[PDB]
């Protein structure tokens with residue numbers, strides 16, 4: 001059993017007041033006061049981020065940890081925060097974004113955020129059974145939290161396998177994907193296998209809540225995976241009992257228009 005497995009048990013052992021205080025302590029949070037109401041009322045002319053996902057991917061790129069270029073696929077696009085982010089980047093030529101939609105799942109938000117015309121959104125699509133196609137950059141932000149760590153491990157394993165399938169079609173593709181439960185040993189095994197064939201490493205973004213162990217794998221970086229995970233587990237355990245609140249920052253505004 002791993003340090004992260006213990007963290008998950010400690011998390012589930014929090015009382016409600018402990019949990020809600022722990023969840024946001026010391027994390028960056030975008031200010032979505034305006035963006036949320038614009039989306040609620042159905043405004044389509046807006047470039048404020050359609051979700052909290054945009055600033056996460058932006059941070060990864062600003063840090064130099066991802067390469068976003070060429071023909072991009074967004075697997076599990078949800079509202080589309082990553083799709084709109086990618087579409088606004090000059091090195092990106094097109095975005096093919098796929099998400100399952102349906103009951104209890106986010107459908108793509110339709111806005112004029114810069115480069116929207118270069119995105120082909122397709123909802124009602126299961127990416128786990130969809131045959132891969134050519135792409136220069138493969139993104140996947142899939143991984144639904146579960147109180148059950150074994151379920152999170154299995155959901156993570158399916159994402160890593162999907163990425164192996166997209167790399168089999170596109171061996172030279174840039175990859176960035178969510179690893180929901182990197183602390184699970186079955187996930188560590190799959191990541192080692194991925195890293196030994198494709199390179200890459202794991203990083204934590206500062207916008208992820210403390211209630212999730214999610215980390216992001218990118219082929220553009222390197223680093224011992226076990227060490228990366230254990231450093232993050234300790235950080236998450238050390239924040240229990242922290243009284244600092246979240247740190248509020250402006251939300252990404254990409255502007256509007258076609259490219």
Ligand SMILES: C[n+]1cn([C@@H]2O[C@H](COP(=O)(O)OP(=O)(O)OP(=O)(O)O)[C@@H](O)[C@H]2O)c2nc(N)[nH]c(=O)c21
Nearest residue numbers: 011012013014015016019023145146147148209211212
């Ligand atoms: C609501 N809640 C969640 N957790 C734990 O925190 C993890 C994440 O729970 P979460 O509520 O922070 O994320 P969610 O599952 O809603 O996904 P989101 O839509 O992206 O926000 C869960 O899998 C549980 O392990 C919780 N743990 C405790 N102790 N008490 C709680 O009320 C509680």
Ligand SMILES: C[S@@+](CC[C@H](N)C(=O)[O-])C[C@H]1O[C@@H](n2cnc3c(N)ncnc32)[C@H](O)[C@@H]1O
Nearest residue numbers: 051053076078080081082099100105126127141
């Ligand atoms: C957390 S969202 C990604 C957030 C996104 N990156 C953003 O910035 O808004 C992950 C999405 O993947 C979708 N999803 C989960 N399983 C899927 C599947 N098998 N096929 C397609 N989409 C799936 C979920 O509905 C969810 O909306």
Ligand SMILES: [Mg+2]
Nearest residue numbers: 023145146211
């Ligand atoms: Mg919740």
